[PDB]
Homo-oligomer: A and B are copies of this chain.
């Protein structure tokens, strides 16, 4: 198996090939989807649903959360939301490797209570072609 701490998401500080992990990041989830575009004819094998595969639109979504630590990289995610950009984000899988895809920054939400930490969640969605450098 692989460690959960080694599965990170990270930003573009300068915007051109400069990657730093964000902050207090208690949880990450790169999450893939496919739109399962159905093609079932009048005859299909006895009544089973037949699917095509490669014609479906496919995507990815990143849901990060953790404690509010003001870094050079936490303020960078603010500037993506107010000035709408699609920078090259990067989610590293412990042993798979770098994904290196353009995501938008769909939902950011800073939260805080009278007795606890300052936290933030951080939702994303895909915006282009992903990769896999292995």
- Chain A residues with a Cβ under 8 A of chain B: 1-7, 24-34, 36, 40, 44-59, 66-70, 74-75, 78, 81-86, 93-96, 104-119, 125-130, 132, 134
* Interchain CB contact under 8 A, B36 and A125: yes
* Interchain CB contact under 8 A, B34 and A112: no
Determine the chain B residues whose CB is within 8 A of the CB of A55 once the complex forms: 47, 84
Of the candidates B34, B94, B129, the one whose C-beta lies within 8 Å of that of A105 is B34
In the bound complex, CA of A90 to CA of B84 (Å) = 22
Determine the chain B residues whose CB is within 8 A of the CB of A48 once the complex forms: 57-59, 126, 128-130
* Interchain CB contact under 8 A, B46 and A82: yes
* Interchain CB contact under 8 A, A45 and B129: yes
In the bound complex, CA of A48 to CA of B127 (Å) = 8
Q: Which residue of chain B is the closest to A67 with respect to CB atoms?
A: B1
Determine the chain B residues whose CB is within 8 A of the CB of A116 once the complex forms: 4
* Interchain CB contact under 8 A, A32 and B109: yes
In the bound complex, CA of A51 to CA of B28 (Å) = 22
Given A29-B110, A36-B106, A53-B85, list of 12 further CB < 8 A pairs? A1-B24, A1-B117, A1-B118, A4-B113, A4-B114, A4-B115, A29-B112, A32-B81, A33-B107, A47-B56, A48-B126, A78-B96
